[model samples]
Target: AECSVDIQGNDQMQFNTNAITVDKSCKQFTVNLSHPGNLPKNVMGHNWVLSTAADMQGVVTDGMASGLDKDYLKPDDSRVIAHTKLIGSGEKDSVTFDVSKLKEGEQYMFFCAAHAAMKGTLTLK
Candidate 1:
């Protein structure tokens, strides 16, 4: 494990993994998301959003309004630790970030801002 994880989404509205862990030793880490099906972005678009559990609700609410044009994310929102672009089928997105933004023992949520149904929990250990 090189302090990174690869996430995938499918046409069935599901993420490959339900949970992810980040080792605290890595000062920086990356995450990549890819879609393997042939679906349009508006219908099955996926974006990997990372944030504290507490901010998860708020981010989803605000992002809902931003829509696909904004990648279903609030612009420069401090609550977001890192996120990938809203991607369609056969597309890939990734983000590299400073682990210093993460807090030890904090519960992080990694989810699809567009489709809240595809989501997971993240932990820094």
Candidate 2:
């Protein structure tokens, strides 16, 4: 099986997974997102966003500036390691990135820009 993880977002502002480990042996890792909420994307959208733990706040701040049309992300922001477009109710998306891009000791996080409550940590091993 491929190195991949599945996560779900609900109207309650939550994600099913809070932590994930990416095996170093895999050349690439994948994150799959699904929203089971019944709300519309504009009201309860969720997206998977990755960045350093320290960069999380800054990324979110800039994302808000970028707005919904930009998928709540700054245009061409290099701090973002990888991300999936915003989705809602029955919608889904996925993001894949080279495993080598992350450092073993560094702290990385994944969060939904639209819903701060939907956040998670990612570890590389």
Candidate 3:
């Protein structure tokens, strides 16, 4: 599907999908996040954060202190492969990165730093 996908989030604090796949032939991929609920940013914000599964916890932990202005992510954090800006109800954000950053067989995860439960995985095939 053109190496692009849309992810939806809502006031219920959830993401619509658990896994995403990227065709290996794609030179780059895009992740788009949309919050279609009624909650506000601070109350229920959502963002797409990409990193290795092993670094998920650490990235989220440090992101909490970075605040919403920084998209709840540590500024220039090398551990993050790519991420979208934080968004609330009716808002949207997207990020595109080179597929070369991903390694075959490596597990990558995407999540909202504000809500640990809102997460998913990306697979490169």
Candidate 4:
């Protein structure tokens, strides 16, 4: 997909795909999240968050305190590789991250903060 991308989130609190493959040739890769459900943001919102699998727990814990206004993410969180703004049903958000920030063979996690189990992996190829 060159430096572009696509993604989807659904009512079941899951992403359509479980993983992403990033081409090394691209300096930047983008991911866009779309919510096809009809629930409101407060009850069933969704967002895409990226971080190393090892950092996921701590990051999520801290992010919960940051709240929805911060996209359910900690403000200026360095551990976050990339993320989308919180989106309600039928809403969408996108984020472009530099490929250089990822390391080959490193395990990275892509997930919805509202549901930890709904996650995926991405590797810099």
What lDDT score belongs to each candidate, Candidate 1 first? 0.86, 0.87, 0.87, 0.83
TM-scores for candidates 1 onward, in order = 0.91, 0.92, 0.91, 0.89
Using TM-score as the yardstick, the better of models 2 and 3 is 2
Off by over 4 Å in 4: none
lDDT of 2 by residue, 66-102 (tens): 8877887898888889999888899999999988778
Candidate 1 lDDT tens digits, 1-125:
46888889888888899998888787888898899989978788888898999999999888878767787788998899998888889999889999888876678989988888788998877
User: TM-score for model 3?
Assistant: 0.91
Worst 10 residues of 4 by lDDT: 1-10
Flag clash pairs in model 4.
none
Hey, what RMSD does candidate 3 come out at?
1.5
lDDT score for residue 48 of model 2: 92
lDDT of 4 at 59: 84
Position 92, candidate 3: lDDT: 92
